[PDB]
From a paper:
In addition to possessing increased stability and membrane permeability, Helicons are capable of binding large, flat protein surfaces that are inaccessible to targeting by small molecules, and Helicons have been developed to target a range of PPI targets in cells and in vivo. Characterizing Helicon-E3 co-structures and mechanisms of action, we identified new binding sites for α-helices on the E3 surfaces, as well as potential probes of the disease-linked E3, WWP123,24, highlighting the generality of our approach against this therapeutically important target class.
First, we focused on the NEDD4-like E3 ligases, which make up approximately a third of the [name] family. The first profile (Group 1) represents Helicons such as those in cluster C71 (C71) that are pan-WWP-binders – binding indiscriminately to inactive and active forms of both [name] domains, which share ~70% sequence identity. These structures revealed three distinct Helicon binding sites on WWP2HECT. In all of the structures, we found that the [name] domains adopted similarly closed (inhibited) conformations. Group 1 Helicons H302 (WWP1HECT-binding) and [name] (WWP2HECT-binding) showed similar binding modes as each other, making contact only with the N-lobe of WWP1HECT or WWP2HECT, respectively. The Group 1 Helicons engage this same E2-binding site within WWP2HECT.
Numbering used by the authors:
A (entry chain A): 492 to 865
B (entry chain E): 5 to 17
């Protein structure tokens, strides 16, 4: 019910309201960016990171405190992704859908490195600086105490999502399916079992079990093997910026606070859009682009997040979009009835746009979905 | 048939 501008003013205000005087110096070189930053920030007291940041890129002498800070935040937000640290991995091909590495304990300091990354992200928000690390909306949901949903599974694992939907909409007592409330996990060669609930090894999934099994399994699909690393990140953040300060944001708004808003190239978008059952000459498609033309930039980004799962664009624009199974341009499909809302498949960067009866119908249903659904 | 897809679901989950 509250707008993003209002929420941004109310958060910034609360940061401005908890500031400290003076400054902190952080000295790094381009070649030891990560290690210098890690030590200096972690041997500092967390609240002191709310003071004015003086980042020294030792050797570079082009300066501007807010410009070197800007550059630092960017470079380091990438350097934490270095595979040598074994902290992160991708659920899909071509660096699609970042997630914490369950095997990260092969790095004996991983929990301390994650608490450092937590601090670094809170420093970015607190100082209004931007990062390009590429966290997913479910990761942001966790920062806002939002539980991942059935829809979210399709982003990380469309086949898992479809198997859960099938269970959700079939009769278990009619097909012979035998499942139990327990999951196998193999991390670094060690295979472990996790009970979804007490005694779940012996509890079989029935029609009367189903809904509970699905929501316990959904949570487990996002939390498995990364509980301790995730806790270390959240603590590191909370040390610097109380997580309580994010109470009003949703996950898509939080991603904008950390990534920054940039102006969306309308031509790049339309040239790189592909169509299923529709064409570029379809009634509803030409209506679609009128609704997008009438949107302000804030709402276009929101449309991008609804369909693709992020506001971030690759190098080379919309032609280079990535899905769960590889390259995957923005796509619009004729799916659904006139009584449905538009729904997205973020793994395929797809908008199921029903064959609406009027421009006014499409405009209201599109704007409603991009604002209230995911 | 429809136990082709239960086997597939069962392997995935
Ligand atoms: C025809 C038939 O019953 N097929 C079938 C159903 C389920 C499963 N697997 C499990 O229940 C785990 C295999 C085959
Ligand atoms: Zn996507």
């Amino acid at each position: 019910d509250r707008s993003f501008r209002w929420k941004y003013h109310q958060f910034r205000f609360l940061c401005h309201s908890n500031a400290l005087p003076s400054h902190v110096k952080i000295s790094v070189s381009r070649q030891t960016l990560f290690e210098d930053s890690f030590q200096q920030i972690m041997n500092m007291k967390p609240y002191d990171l709310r003071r004015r940041l003086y980042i020294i890129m030792r050797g570079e002498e082009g300066l501007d405190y807010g410009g070197i800070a800007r550059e630092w935040f960017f470079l380091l937000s990438h350097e934490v992704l270095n595979p040598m640290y074994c902290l992160f991995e991708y659920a899909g091909k071509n660096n699609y859908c970042l997630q914490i590495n369950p095997a990260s304990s092969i790095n004996p300091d991983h929990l301390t490195y994650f608490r450092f990354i937590g601090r670094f992200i809170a420093m970015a928000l607190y100082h209004g600086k931007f990062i390009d690390t590429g966290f997913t909306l479910p990761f942001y949901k966790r920062m806002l105490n939002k539980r991942p949903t059935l829809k979210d599974l399709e982003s990380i694992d469309p086949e898992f999502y479809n198997s859960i939907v099938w269970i959700k909409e079939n009769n278990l007592e009619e097909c012979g399916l035998e499942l139990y409330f327990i999951q196998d996990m193999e991390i670094l060669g060690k295979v472990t079992t996790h009970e979804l609930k007490e005694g779940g090894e012996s509890i079989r999934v029935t029609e009367e079990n189903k809904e509970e099994y699905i929501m316990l399994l959904t949570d487990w699909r996002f939390t498995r093997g990364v509980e301790e690393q995730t806790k270390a990140f959240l603590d590191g953040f909370n040390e610097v910026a109380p997580l309580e300060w994010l109470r009003y944001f949703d996950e898509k708004e939080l991603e904008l606070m950390l990534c920054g808003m940039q102006e969306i190239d309308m031509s790049d978008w339309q040239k790189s859009t592909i169509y299923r059952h529709y064409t570029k000459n379809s009634k509803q498609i030409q209506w679609f682009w009128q609704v997008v033309k009438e949107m302000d930039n804030e709402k276009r980004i929101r449309l991008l997040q609804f369909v693709t799962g992020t506001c971030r664009l690759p190098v080379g624009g919309f032609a280079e979009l990535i899905g769960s199974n590889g390259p995957q341009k923005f796509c619009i499909d004729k799916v659904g009835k006139e009584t449905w809302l538009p729904r997205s498949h973020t793994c395929f960067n797809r908008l199921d746009l029903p064959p609406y009866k009027s421009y006014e119908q499409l405009r209201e249903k599109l704007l409603y979905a991009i604002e209230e659904t995911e | 048939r429809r136990c082709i897809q239960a086997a597939r679901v069962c392997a995935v989950l």
